[PDB]
PDB file of C-alpha atoms in Angstrom:
ATOM      1  CA  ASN A   1      32.788 105.034 -47.167  1.00 11.68           C
ATOM      2  CA  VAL A   2      31.852 108.931 -47.223  1.00 11.48           C
ATOM      3  CA  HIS A   3      28.311 108.574 -46.659  1.00 11.95           C
ATOM      4  CA  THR A   4      26.120 105.480 -45.761  1.00 13.21           C
ATOM      5  CA  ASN A   5      25.682 104.914 -49.576  1.00 13.47           C
ATOM      6  CA  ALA A   6      27.172 101.287 -50.137  1.00 12.80           C
ATOM      7  CA  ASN A   7      25.741  99.992 -46.959  1.00  9.93           C
ATOM      8  CA  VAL A   8      24.294  96.250 -47.747  1.00  8.29           C
ATOM      9  CA  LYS A   9      20.917  95.987 -45.459  1.00  4.85           C
ATOM     10  CA  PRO A  10      20.193  92.892 -44.248  1.00  4.88           C
ATOM     11  CA  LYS A  11      16.446  91.504 -45.415  1.00  5.80           C
ATOM     12  CA  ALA A  12      13.662  91.675 -42.922  1.00  5.14           C
ATOM     13  CA  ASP A  13      12.277  88.593 -42.117  1.00  4.42           C
ATOM     14  CA  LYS A  14       8.466  88.704 -42.383  1.00  3.00           C
ATOM     15  CA  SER A  15       6.988  86.661 -40.277  1.00  2.00           C
ATOM     16  CA  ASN A  16       8.937  88.399 -37.334  1.00  2.00           C
ATOM     17  CA  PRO A  17       6.149  91.676 -36.102  1.00  2.00           C
ATOM     18  CA  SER A  18       9.149  92.525 -34.329  1.00  2.00           C
ATOM     19  CA  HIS A  19      11.075  93.680 -38.000  1.00  2.00           C
ATOM     20  CA  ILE A  20       9.495  96.489 -39.730  1.00  3.49           C
ATOM     21  CA  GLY A  21      10.531  96.566 -43.378  1.00  2.76           C
ATOM     22  CA  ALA A  22      11.110  98.145 -46.682  1.00  3.80           C
ATOM     23  CA  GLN A  23       7.758  98.927 -48.685  1.00  3.57           C
ATOM     24  CA  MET A  24       9.187 100.692 -51.748  1.00  2.00           C
ATOM     25  CA  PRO A  25      12.394 101.834 -53.208  1.00  2.00           C
ATOM     26  CA  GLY A  26      13.691 104.763 -51.523  1.00  2.00           C
ATOM     27  CA  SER A  27      15.736 107.152 -49.854  1.00  2.00           C
ATOM     28  CA  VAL A  28      15.951 107.271 -46.040  1.00  2.00           C
ATOM     29  CA  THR A  29      15.043 111.359 -45.535  1.00  2.00           C
ATOM     30  CA  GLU A  30      14.922 112.170 -41.768  1.00  2.00           C
ATOM     31  CA  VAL A  31      15.943 109.809 -39.202  1.00  2.00           C
ATOM     32  CA  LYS A  32      13.869 110.351 -36.417  1.00  2.00           C
ATOM     33  CA  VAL A  33      14.324 108.192 -33.081  1.00  2.00           C
ATOM     34  CA  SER A  34      17.806 106.149 -31.950  1.00  2.00           C
ATOM     35  CA  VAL A  35      18.562 102.630 -29.943  1.00  2.00           C
ATOM     36  CA  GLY A  36      17.239 103.391 -27.037  1.00  2.00           C
ATOM     37  CA  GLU A  37      13.821 104.767 -27.674  1.00  2.00           C
ATOM     38  CA  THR A  38      10.002 104.632 -26.135  1.00  2.00           C
ATOM     39  CA  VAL A  39       7.076 106.373 -27.635  1.00  2.00           C
ATOM     40  CA  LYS A  40       4.047 106.032 -28.579  1.00  2.00           C
ATOM     41  CA  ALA A  41       2.455 103.748 -30.363  1.00  2.00           C
ATOM     42  CA  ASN A  42       1.910 105.795 -34.133  1.00  2.00           C
ATOM     43  CA  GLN A  43       5.267 107.616 -33.688  1.00  2.00           C
ATOM     44  CA  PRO A  44       6.302 108.577 -36.257  1.00  2.00           C
ATOM     45  CA  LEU A  45      10.003 107.026 -36.475  1.00  2.00           C
ATOM     46  CA  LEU A  46      11.649 107.245 -39.579  1.00  2.00           C
ATOM     47  CA  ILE A  47      10.506 109.950 -43.010  1.00  2.00           C
ATOM     48  CA  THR A  48      11.194 107.667 -46.462  1.00  2.00           C
ATOM     49  CA  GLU A  49      11.424 109.611 -49.829  1.00  2.00           C
ATOM     50  CA  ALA A  50       9.547 106.823 -52.119  1.00  2.00           C
ATOM     51  CA  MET A  51       9.850 108.480 -55.678  1.00  2.00           C
ATOM     52  CA  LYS A  52       9.535 112.887 -55.303  1.00  2.00           C
ATOM     53  CA  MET A  53       6.810 111.077 -52.598  1.00  2.00           C
ATOM     54  CA  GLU A  54       7.186 111.302 -48.863  1.00  2.00           C
ATOM     55  CA  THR A  55       5.778 109.447 -46.204  1.00  2.00           C
ATOM     56  CA  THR A  56       6.521 108.808 -42.538  1.00  2.00           C
ATOM     57  CA  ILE A  57       6.691 105.321 -41.379  1.00  2.00           C
ATOM     58  CA  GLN A  58       4.977 104.036 -38.044  1.00  2.00           C
ATOM     59  CA  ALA A  59       5.031 102.062 -34.882  1.00  2.00           C
ATOM     60  CA  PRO A  60       2.061  99.310 -34.851  1.00  2.00           C
ATOM     61  CA  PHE A  61       1.761  98.707 -31.725  1.00  2.00           C
ATOM     62  CA  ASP A  62       4.155 100.406 -28.073  1.00  2.00           C
ATOM     63  CA  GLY A  63       7.805  99.323 -27.744  1.00  2.00           C
ATOM     64  CA  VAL A  64      11.122 100.115 -27.497  1.00  2.00           C
ATOM     65  CA  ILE A  65      13.785 100.779 -30.740  1.00  2.00           C
ATOM     66  CA  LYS A  66      15.586  97.454 -30.634  1.00  2.00           C
ATOM     67  CA  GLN A  67      18.191  98.585 -33.635  1.00  2.00           C
ATOM     68  CA  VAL A  68      17.835 101.943 -36.626  1.00  2.00           C
ATOM     69  CA  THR A  69      19.255 100.491 -39.495  1.00  2.00           C
ATOM     70  CA  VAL A  70      19.599 103.448 -41.945  1.00  2.00           C
ATOM     71  CA  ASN A  71      21.275 106.968 -42.046  1.00  2.00           C
ATOM     72  CA  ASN A  72      20.087 109.983 -43.279  1.00  2.00           C
ATOM     73  CA  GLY A  73      20.265 109.785 -46.645  1.00  2.00           C
ATOM     74  CA  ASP A  74      20.240 106.547 -47.185  1.00  2.00           C
ATOM     75  CA  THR A  75      19.162 104.540 -49.853  1.00  2.00           C
ATOM     76  CA  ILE A  76      16.593 101.175 -49.165  1.00  2.00           C
ATOM     77  CA  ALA A  77      15.055  98.808 -50.984  1.00  2.00           C
ATOM     78  CA  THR A  78      12.299  96.711 -50.901  1.00  2.00           C
ATOM     79  CA  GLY A  79      11.996  93.764 -47.926  1.00  2.00           C
ATOM     80  CA  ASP A  80      14.961  96.061 -45.988  1.00  2.00           C
ATOM     81  CA  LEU A  81      15.328  95.862 -42.579  1.00  2.00           C
ATOM     82  CA  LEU A  82      14.166  98.993 -41.901  1.00  2.00           C
ATOM     83  CA  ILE A  83      13.400  99.585 -37.285  1.00  2.00           C
ATOM     84  CA  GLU A  84      12.823  96.387 -34.743  1.00  2.00           C
ATOM     85  CA  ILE A  85      10.679  97.229 -31.740  1.00  2.00           C
ATOM     86  CA  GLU A  86       9.358  95.259 -28.838  1.00  2.00           C
TER      87      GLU A  86
ATOM     88  CA  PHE B   1      36.768  50.672 -50.491  1.00  2.00           C
ATOM     89  CA  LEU B   2      37.534  50.267 -47.333  1.00  2.00           C
ATOM     90  CA  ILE B   3      34.605  49.898 -45.814  1.00  2.00           C
ATOM     91  CA  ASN B   4      33.636  46.681 -48.344  1.00  2.00           C
ATOM     92  CA  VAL B   5      36.614  45.509 -46.293  1.00  2.00           C
ATOM     93  CA  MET B   6      34.967  46.086 -42.862  1.00  2.00           C
ATOM     94  CA  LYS B   7      31.143  45.293 -43.722  1.00  2.00           C
ATOM     95  CA  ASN B   8      33.245  41.853 -45.071  1.00  2.00           C
ATOM     96  CA  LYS B   9      32.180  38.226 -43.219  1.00  2.00           C
ATOM     97  CA  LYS B  10      35.688  36.927 -43.571  1.00  2.00           C
ATOM     98  CA  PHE B  11      37.370  39.877 -41.709  1.00  2.00           C
ATOM     99  CA  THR B  12      34.946  40.405 -39.268  1.00  2.00           C
ATOM    100  CA  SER B  13      35.371  36.751 -38.273  1.00  2.00           C
ATOM    101  CA  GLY B  14      38.985  37.821 -37.257  1.00  2.00           C
ATOM    102  CA  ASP B  15      40.338  34.104 -39.670  1.00  2.00           C
ATOM    103  CA  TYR B  16      41.756  35.654 -41.935  1.00  2.00           C
ATOM    104  CA  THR B  17      44.454  35.568 -44.085  1.00  2.00           C
ATOM    105  CA  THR B  18      47.276  37.242 -46.747  1.00  2.00           C
ATOM    106  CA  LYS B  19      45.001  36.183 -49.104  1.00  2.00           C
ATOM    107  CA  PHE B  20      41.610  37.768 -47.799  1.00  2.00           C
ATOM    108  CA  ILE B  21      41.526  40.542 -50.082  1.00  2.00           C
ATOM    109  CA  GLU B  22      42.243  38.362 -53.579  1.00  2.00           C
ATOM    110  CA  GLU B  23      39.861  35.654 -52.351  1.00  2.00           C
ATOM    111  CA  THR B  24      37.172  38.529 -52.245  1.00  2.00           C
ATOM    112  CA  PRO B  25      36.530  40.059 -55.521  1.00  2.00           C
ATOM    113  CA  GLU B  26      32.946  41.450 -54.110  1.00  2.02           C
ATOM    114  CA  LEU B  27      35.618  44.108 -52.316  1.00  3.11           C
ATOM    115  CA  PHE B  28      35.670  45.843 -55.960  1.00  2.00           C
ATOM    116  CA  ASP B  29      31.616  46.649 -55.724  1.00  2.00           C
ATOM    117  CA  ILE B  30      31.754  49.956 -55.923  1.00  2.00           C
ATOM    118  CA  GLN B  31      28.862  52.944 -57.244  1.00  2.00           C
ATOM    119  CA  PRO B  32      29.580  56.115 -58.214  1.00  2.00           C
ATOM    120  CA  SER B  33      29.481  57.955 -54.804  1.00  2.00           C
ATOM    121  CA  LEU B  34      25.944  59.519 -55.044  1.00  2.00           C
ATOM    122  CA  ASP B  35      26.670  63.937 -54.256  1.00  2.00           C
ATOM    123  CA  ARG B  36      23.891  65.306 -54.064  1.00  2.00           C
ATOM    124  CA  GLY B  37      24.723  68.276 -51.991  1.00  2.00           C
ATOM    125  CA  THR B  38      27.720  69.733 -53.739  1.00  2.00           C
ATOM    126  CA  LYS B  39      25.638  69.040 -57.581  1.00  2.00           C
ATOM    127  CA  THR B  40      22.641  71.569 -55.807  1.00  2.00           C
ATOM    128  CA  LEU B  41      25.342  74.365 -54.430  1.00  2.00           C
ATOM    129  CA  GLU B  42      26.661  73.885 -58.127  1.00  2.00           C
ATOM    130  CA  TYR B  43      23.187  75.415 -59.746  1.00  2.00           C
ATOM    131  CA  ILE B  44      22.024  78.656 -57.180  1.00  2.00           C
ATOM    132  CA  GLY B  45      25.689  79.602 -57.871  1.00  2.00           C
ATOM    133  CA  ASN B  46      25.204  79.602 -62.146  1.00  2.00           C
ATOM    134  CA  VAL B  47      22.368  81.014 -61.940  1.00  2.00           C
ATOM    135  CA  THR B  48      23.688  83.440 -59.290  1.00  2.00           C
ATOM    136  CA  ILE B  49      26.708  84.874 -61.663  1.00  2.00           C
ATOM    137  CA  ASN B  50      25.050  83.583 -65.249  1.00  2.00           C
ATOM    138  CA  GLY B  51      21.502  84.092 -64.693  1.00  2.00           C
ATOM    139  CA  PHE B  52      18.437  82.166 -65.942  1.00  2.00           C
ATOM    140  CA  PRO B  53      16.950  81.507 -70.256  1.00  2.00           C
ATOM    141  CA  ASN B  54      15.152  84.473 -70.949  1.00  2.00           C
ATOM    142  CA  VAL B  55      14.051  85.796 -67.488  1.00  2.00           C
ATOM    143  CA  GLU B  56      15.372  89.271 -66.752  1.00  2.00           C
ATOM    144  CA  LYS B  57      18.523  89.074 -65.133  1.00  2.00           C
ATOM    145  CA  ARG B  58      17.664  90.820 -61.925  1.00  2.00           C
ATOM    146  CA  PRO B  59      18.556  90.988 -57.819  1.00  2.00           C
ATOM    147  CA  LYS B  60      15.912  88.066 -56.123  1.00  2.00           C
ATOM    148  CA  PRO B  61      12.907  90.107 -56.440  1.00  2.00           C
ATOM    149  CA  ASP B  62      11.116  90.781 -53.165  1.00  2.00           C
ATOM    150  CA  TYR B  63       8.013  88.163 -52.683  1.00  2.00           C
ATOM    151  CA  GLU B  64       5.003  88.630 -49.455  1.00  2.00           C
ATOM    152  CA  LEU B  65       5.111  85.276 -47.849  1.00  2.00           C
ATOM    153  CA  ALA B  66       2.671  82.595 -48.930  1.00  2.00           C
ATOM    154  CA  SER B  67       0.610  81.388 -46.290  1.00  2.00           C
ATOM    155  CA  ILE B  68      -0.153  77.551 -47.943  1.00  2.00           C
ATOM    156  CA  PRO B  69      -3.163  76.273 -45.878  1.00  2.00           C
ATOM    157  CA  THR B  70      -3.189  72.356 -45.463  1.00  2.00           C
ATOM    158  CA  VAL B  71      -4.890  69.578 -44.355  1.00  2.00           C
ATOM    159  CA  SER B  72      -3.834  66.217 -42.527  1.00  2.00           C
ATOM    160  CA  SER B  73      -2.622  62.984 -44.949  1.00  3.13           C
ATOM    161  CA  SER B  74      -5.119  61.121 -42.534  1.00  3.14           C
ATOM    162  CA  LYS B  75      -8.127  63.232 -43.501  1.00  6.18           C
ATOM    163  CA  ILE B  76      -7.464  63.290 -47.205  1.00  8.91           C
ATOM    164  CA  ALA B  77      -6.881  59.245 -46.624  1.00  7.85           C
ATOM    165  CA  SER B  78     -11.110  59.378 -45.232  1.00  5.35           C
ATOM    166  CA  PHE B  79     -12.288  60.722 -48.303  1.00  6.52           C
ATOM    167  CA  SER B  80     -14.122  59.015 -51.246  1.00  5.62           C
ATOM    168  CA  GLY B  81     -14.806  61.336 -54.385  1.00  2.00           C
ATOM    169  CA  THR B  82     -14.784  60.313 -57.707  1.00  2.99           C
ATOM    170  CA  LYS B  83     -11.495  58.462 -57.780  1.00  2.00           C
ATOM    171  CA  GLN B  84     -13.052  55.383 -55.472  1.00  2.00           C
ATOM    172  CA  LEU B  85     -15.911  55.880 -57.325  1.00  5.18           C
ATOM    173  CA  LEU B  86     -14.226  54.760 -60.478  1.00  5.96           C
ATOM    174  CA  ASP B  87     -11.945  52.193 -58.424  1.00  9.31           C
ATOM    175  CA  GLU B  88     -15.863  51.612 -57.107  1.00 10.03           C
ATOM    176  CA  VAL B  89     -17.852  50.865 -60.477  1.00 10.90           C
ATOM    177  CA  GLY B  90     -15.394  51.396 -63.433  1.00 12.89           C
TER     178      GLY B  90
END
């Protein structure tokens, strides 16, 4: 592509605790976890930039990251799947 | 038409001649083939590409999941409210 800004992300299924969805339209500023990792509850796994403002996305529980749908500097839309955990 | 032939009494008996078709006018009893499924894809197809009357043409917005509370038909059927009152006294 030349970067990954054209990439369409699947929508997170809302009634599945494994699926973490994008809460706002933002930009992925920093990816912090990869496929097959295990960190504690509240682990800062993704850093988005909403609109000049920055929030870390945290894990709701303990578990193993199955998929990360995004890369650094990627645009996101409300309801976009970002992370899946076990 | 073929269904009609297959379903017909004279055909299933096995005793039928070359006259069978002409002597049975009700084989051309053909209703227009109702087609709900295709029509629905046409609508969605249309609104997706060309939008809806005075709704801001945009990506289908993100909607928060809805928990729709439910009550059993039977439970409803046991209820006696103002409707039953009306039928009761007028």
